[PDB]
Every structure is written in structure tokens, then in C-alpha cells.
């Protein structure tokens, strides 16, 4: 649960609009609020759960590319 190390999650494609919002939120705040997520989801025509996932994916790079690792 905490970290997606044990379990695996598949990825899905999104539209420019959907991505925009997501990136617009993840950019301002790495970890949004249940209220913001639920709303954003319906706003981008997505499921809260999915929304949260996208964020996790982004972080992956933010660390890989960043000096955080290596």
C-alpha cells in the first residue's frame, strides 16, 4: 500500500486537457487533498484513484532525473 513496491499498477494514456490539469496540480502541490483530487478527477473526466496514480508516476522521474538518486 504505502509504496507501489509489492503491487504493480498499469499505465494509461490521457488527453492534453487531462494532462494539463494533473501537471497543473502536481506542479503547485506534490500531494493534493482528497477534496481537490475528487473534484479534479470529475473535472478531467477521470477517477480519483487514477488521478492519484498519475502523480506517483511523475515523482518517479522527479527523483530519477534529479540528484536525489545517483
Swiss-Prot record:
Residues 8-64 bind DNA. It is found in: Nucleus. Belongs to the paired homeobox family. Bicoid subfamily. Regulates chordin (CHRD). May play a role in spatial programing within discrete embryonic fields or lineage compartments during organogenesis. In concert with NKX3-2, plays a role in defining the structural components of the middle ear; required for the development of the entire tympanic ring. Probably involved in the regulatory networks that define neural crest cell fate specification and determine mesoderm cell lineages in mammals. It is linked to Short stature, auditory canal atresia, mandibular hypoplasia, skeletal abnormalities: An autosomal recessive developmental disorder with features of a first and second branchial arch syndrome, and with unique rhizomelic skeletal anomalies. Craniofacial abnormalities can lead to conductive hearing loss, respiratory insufficiency, and feeding difficulties. Skeletal features include bilateral humeral hypoplasia, humeroscapular synostosis, pelvic abnormalities, and proximal defects of the femora. This is Homeobox protein goosecoid. It comes from Homo sapiens. The lineage of its organism: Eukaryota, Metazoa, Chordata, Craniata, Vertebrata. The chain holds residues 161 to 217 of 257 of the full protein.
Amino acid at each position: 500500500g504505502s509504496s507501489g513496491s509489492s503491487g504493480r499498477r498499469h499505465r494509461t494514456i490521457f488527453t492534453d486537457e487531462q494532462l494539463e490539469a494533473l501537471e497543473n496540480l502536481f506542479q503547485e502541490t506534490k500531494y493534493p487533498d482528497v477534496g481537490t483530487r475528487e473534484q479534479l478527477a470529475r473535472k478531467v473526466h477521470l477517477r480519483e484513484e487514477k488521478v492519484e496514480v498519475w502523480f506517483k508516476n511523475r515523482r518517479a522521474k522527479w527523483r530519477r532525473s534529479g540528484p536525489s538518486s545517483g
